[PDB]
Design a protein around this ligand. Structure first.
Ligand SMILES: O=C(O)c1cccc2cc[nH]c12
Length: 69
């Protein structure tokens, strides 16, 4: 309907991403693989960046954009 729920939808993407990044096997995959996965789930580059900072493994915004280019 008329309510897009943009904020809660963005929050769910980032929290799902944080949970992905913390998975035991996912942690032992390269940053590029993780970035590509999150992009395929509809995260923006900023949201990917935010998720990496939240798991204590900050990546610069430019690093994310380079992987996705
Ligand atoms: O998206 C996840 O939370 C997730 C968790 C554990 C393994 C995989 C593999 C792709 N995605 C995963």
């Amino acid at each position: 309907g008329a309510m897009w729920h943009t904020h809660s939808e963005r929050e769910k993407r980032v929290s799902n991403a944080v949970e992905f990044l913390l998975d035991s096997r996912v942690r032992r995959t390269p940053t590029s693989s993780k970035v590509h996965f999150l992009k395929s789930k509809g995260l923006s580059a900023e949201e990917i960046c935010e998720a990496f900072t939240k798991v204590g493994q900050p990546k610069t915004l430019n690093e994310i954009k380079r992987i996705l280019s």
